[PDB]
């Protein structure tokens, strides 16, 4: 029964006002020791540059008008209170999307007899961290979280850390994303001198297997067919089909990968780069291949193929280590020669690019 | 005289000197017993891609206080009354496993006083939990989703939960159609956290549920299985036609699409991998190898003795191979031969892989 | 001016309390006569199994402490009141998605001098009705709507119907969906004896024309080309193209139709069934057609086609009523024969399936 | 002395014995006149697929009460003051035609008292109405969307609306870009309902609006019209090539896609049908018929005298047909002939259909 | 402790009323100096013509009944207050979508002893700015933001600017979109004389790289194959395949680009224009190519190709600088000639259009 009397004595509207803050001896600052405790990293939406987490941030401070005599009140060293009626320092994100800053539940608050207070409510937070996307999927993202009041300043409160690292004891594995470090730093401005903030910097690494399987393997597997249409004979009447199909599949994969990543024109990933390059390559291939096909399907009556071709190509034969040769047959052989030359330089350039990636 | 008049007098006497935020106990050492339970109403959605679970659930709590007592013979034989849950004590019951939710009931249905201090409360709720999704035997999958209720600011020496029924009631369950609840158990537990020294209790409800596999079996796997018979067949197709690589490319692109489409329905967890994606991947591998070997063939066939040469040893080798194959300068005949010998090996390989992959499960 | 005095006399906080219900002579039940009046059937979202309607549900009941003497108050038989301050029995859905139960506007309430009360607010309701999808689109859906309080029980109120049918006087046609019947039934439980509910069972029929045109016609029109590739000659080098295109269009239509309907594995519609069957058919066609093509391209040097073929096929000729037949020519004729046989059995099976649907 | 002090004294005198829920009339048989009007601000969206219409609109009401009167010479010559619409009488004005909305204003902007009891109110609102969409002459369409305001619990002998301006003001209209408002009229009406015996009034605002057709004309119909020239052309393509059915299949699939894509932009009403879907359907019909006839042709051409026979009467028939066609043993000539004769008929048919379909409208 | 007494003396309900505004000496206007401070430009949704920003708008004004004697109240020159209880001038957008006008947090308010007031709450604003889309993606958009009260008029308040430019001290870079200028102008109406507004005109430029890579390069790369099918020989039997594939890819890109941009029929972008033109070109190509193919596959028995062809074409040969020519061979050569002529004029027209763009 005493609890009732004690409470209804503490929160008396006449004795205790909430709209003000506890101060004495010359407007001394009230310290606010806060530390965050993660629970799980729900999601990281790249396309929108957002991160959804669940968090319990423990605040602690001191109030000089919430004290009592324990022996009077049947030796009570501790009580619960509602966190709407007592004072409390406003503390939220600043980089928040959804325009939702404050916490959700507004839990109870512990109170001792020395006046201390220890309050931790839960929260789901939608932070906005910028995605550095160059080594996709093997990337190390870096998501920031601010904390500072938005009613008071440094000349009325002073925030402090308790542990330089964000606790992780109640954390549940996330699957995709895996943490590395959770540093937390206090920050202050000398030019302003009224800007105190706490910044926690989650460092995350992605597990690559999923996107590897679903994107990379098909990608490389398909682009491995661009250096091959040259080894196909022009009598089949099929080079166009293969080349076209490859180009279209390639464009599709490109659009898709550009969908999965955000539209930040600041940096470009590696995969889209490689894909654009090999696309340019394969279109050069299609045009040179149509030229080859035309020269192959020429007849004697229509063209004479006067000197230059004869000597130039029937003498270029050995430089390739390609060998040893009715006019239509000579046409066909010229075509064979030129296509093999192009095949050589194309495989060379493919290896060159694969090196360029390292 | 009127029951309503006595009801007023009672209700007005009870709430004269009451304080919500005061715990309802006479001796500080004494604890209250919060009998607890659930009753599903439906299972709205289970989002695999985001790993979430939505439930509509009728929470059930009951306890006993020492101030909301009276005598019924003095107030015209009334024992039970109904008052809002906004004027009395109401415990803090939370689920630590929320994801885009509210952490507590926001509907605040009324409460039933029972003349002996006993009080009973049944507010509805829509809860969004996050349960890890294991996907290997897709679609024949048994999922296991959890919900961890418990108190926030009250230790075990002030509050102590009690599970009413060890199973989740399903009297008004609404068949969702795709997911069925095999079983749903409720466990009691305790823990100790870093914040503090005291121990805190908790209750853990586990739903083990199954997926009805007809839909994805009818619309997703049958076509990917039906266009895999055509992976090895191109070899039985000659070279004079000109329709080999067409078939091969079509099959390759189709399988790539089906894989790139199923990646939309499953999460991006890397711990495990489904059994369908892996099979489709092996198939795509072997079919691109097939396009390579068949272009090599096509090149062989269309050769000519003047342009090309060096059938030095191949004569003996292939005229010695053809009898074993029970098949009796010919660029055409050796092409036929090599085609057949690769066809046999590839049918063997597709057979053996499709087989040795699905066996350990069954 | 009297209206003011009358009202401020009725709703006096001392004389009238709202948190209780009107009772006398031994806790007698207060009857609650409610009937619903539809306004329009906004939507029926199949993919999610939801129905959105607009509704005016008229409730009526009796209160013994809201009476007066008409002649005293200048002969006033009727007044308006706000529906927050007076008593009112809670009445909502139970099968509601959105977790939104109660009504929106909370309109005024009529009051006579005998104490009766007649209150109808508006509402938009998102009910959850299960879709029986087998005769798509010619289907007759059946959407249910519950009504019962969620604070009281049968030993304190008793709900009642006024008309067994839901009024449709203010209804505006819906276009797609067309009503047939709107029965309403009271339901009670003997084992429980504290479960009173009112269930209205809207019976709806879809108008088929739209989906007919947009899905069926293309579907049948395309599948009508699966029994035809056999009548195509193998020298054209084109059977593969047609067959493949048909199969792909078919798979596309299948995925689409499975998108438009909900993912209930409880039952499978007729269209997807027919489509899967004919897909199996056309793949069998592609494989037998490649076999035919191979046997057609064979040459004399490579194979001898020793006795069996000659007699078996050149004697099977008449059983088909197909007629009357250099070795390559015999090859080609064998191919013709076998493909015609397959054509016969395939058209037979197509008719057989069309019958199987009836 | 100060205007503010007199303003306080007045405001404090007025709201001493006032009752919101009491109708402001001295004699019960006397009615109030609620002058009513609108003023658009923009036309956010018109969702055809769901048949909805979103509007941002500045409602305008004004009436007169008999208690909010005073004398200005006694209070330092103040006639107009401004008070919230949360402390005075405020009529119930609803639209019966809502769809996923709020049925009333909840912004609750202040109100202006004018010293003679007259009061004036102008709360904004976002309204979601449901207007039936007629789609035949797509995209050249004139839509007609309605909004039915009226009172809820007040008959015509207690409240009586009055339309201020017979047209909807458009002084701050914000050009949406795609839809233009031809005209917008406001009608008065009465009705009687089943609930009750008295009659109830209502006001009906009708917006007749047009669609600017450049976008869908430059992105949707020009390509479907551009790939229909190629429906009849395959016949002028010979049979030795092998690219007839390729063209035909491509055209068929493309048209099917365009139809299956436009079905996303129009509702699923069955009363009517657009004019584009029907034309595309006829085109798909004729092109599949074309693939049938051209496969028959291809079969004819590739025949041979040994394999096939029975040119018994076709000789006379086709050698008598070829001169009329002005085209001057061997099967190939007859294939050419039959191809030409079908080409003429199909160009005629496509011409005649594309024509006789679009004429009655214009 | 004094703070309590001071506050509870200022906001006394009798001494201070909120529903009125501060005035003296003949209904003098109360000035309202407001200036906006951006924080970040969240998004610009073209398809819906919307812009989402985060903003802190600082208002300042003067009230004559919120003053005190500092020396009496322990020398307090400044206090905080809640911004619900004090007066405040309503100030919002007018072009707002979402129907949400007012601010979110309703922060505290500073108060000095001279009566001044300095109040800045935060906000997320969804403005509606019309998109001028012709030079896509190299476009300079122009998004407007209004500010004016919606309860008062010019004869009771007068808004004013403090700095002609919107501060950018806290602007965090946006990635895609880059600012150029943030002018702010006061606007008044002479005909009305009761219309004061403040309009800030953000001028934005898009960074092109992303959409460049993902759309333009494929788009030009593909359309670069429309002038080439003519150089392909008609014996391959493949022109149709290539032309058709190009046309279909083209239509796809067109539909896509029309999706990404809003459906404003007022103006048309450049890319869709170029694409439609080259589509028309390629269909003309397909029809002339089928004509060429037919004339190529003619035989001597079927047609005589009497005089005109012989002289006209075998004499047109030199005008092309194309050279130097059994009847079937003459057919084939006529086809070659005509296709080369068409190739010439088509490359000419392609260059002509590329010029037409400049
Ligand atoms: C003060 C007030 N409430 C608390 C709630 C909790 C804790 C500490 C608290 N301290 C953690 C330990 N028990 C439940 C959670 C988590
Ligand atoms: C009393 C209280 N509410 C009513 C609501 C309505 C009516 C009569 C009422 N009478 C009908 C006429 N106006 C809206 C509906 C329907
Ligand atoms: C704290 C902050 O705002 N920015 C930091 C900066 O202090 C530091 O120079 C740099 C290297 O650590 O990383 C970033
Ligand atoms: C590895 C790494 O870069 N960590 C960074 C840190 O250097 C920086 O101070 C802060 C602001 O960028 O975000 C985090
Ligand atoms: C069938 C099954 O595995 N049920 C598990 C249970 O064994 C486990 O104790 C609990 C916690 O992981 O989750 C669930
Ligand atoms: C009312 C109810 O809950 N279920 C009904 C059941 O009573 C009835 O036997 C059956 C045939 O009418 O249709 C269902
Ligand atoms: C034609 C028809 O089946 N109407 C049913 C009715 O039989 C049943 O009582 C109720 C519950 O299923 O829903 C409705
Ligand atoms: C141009 C036009 O048709 N306007 C119609 C009007 O004639 C009709 O009275 C009203 C009710 O249907 O809807 C609108
Ligand atoms: C302020 C406004 O409403 N419209 C302006 C107009 O004043 C001005 O003539 C024009 C050129 O600056 O740009 C626009
Ligand atoms: C560069 C430019 O056009 N800035 C314009 C300005 O001229 C105009 O006054 C206002 C209204 O259009 O919007 C902004």
Author numbering:
A (entry chain B), C (entry chain E), E (entry chain C): 2 to 326, 333 to 365
B (entry chain A), D (entry chain D): 5 to 332, 563 to 596
Sentences reproduced from the published study:
The cation-selective nicotinic acetylcholine receptor (nAChR) is a prototypical member of neurotransmitter-gated ion channels of the Cys-loop receptor family. The human α4β2 subtype is a heteropentamer and the α4, β2 subunits can assemble heterogeneously (2:3 or 3:2), which have nearly identical secondary structures. For cryoEM sample preparation, the expression was repeated for this selected construct in the presence of the partial agonist varenicline, purified to homogeneity as a complex with BAK5 and vitrified for data collection. We determined the cryoEM structures of the sAB bound receptor at a global resolution of 3.7 Å and 3.9 Å. Local resolution at the core of the receptor is ~3.5 Å and is consistent with the side chain features throughout the density maps. Insertion of BRIL did not introduce any local or global distortions in the structure as evident by superposition of the BRIL-fused α4 subunits with the α4 subunits from PDB ID: CNJ12 without any BRIL fusion (RMSD Cα = 0.7 Å).
The 12 kDa BRIL has a 4-helix bundle fold arranged with the N- and C- termini separated by a distance similar to that between adjacent TMHs of α-helical membrane proteins. We hypothesized that the addition of a 50 kDa Fab, with its distinctive elongated two-domain shape, would facilitate accurate orientation of the proteins, even when most of their structure is embedded in the membrane. Among the cohort of sABs, we identified sAB24 that was virtually universal—it bound under every manifestation of the BRIL incorporation. We affinity matured this sAB and obtained several variants with subnanomolar binding affinity to BRIL.
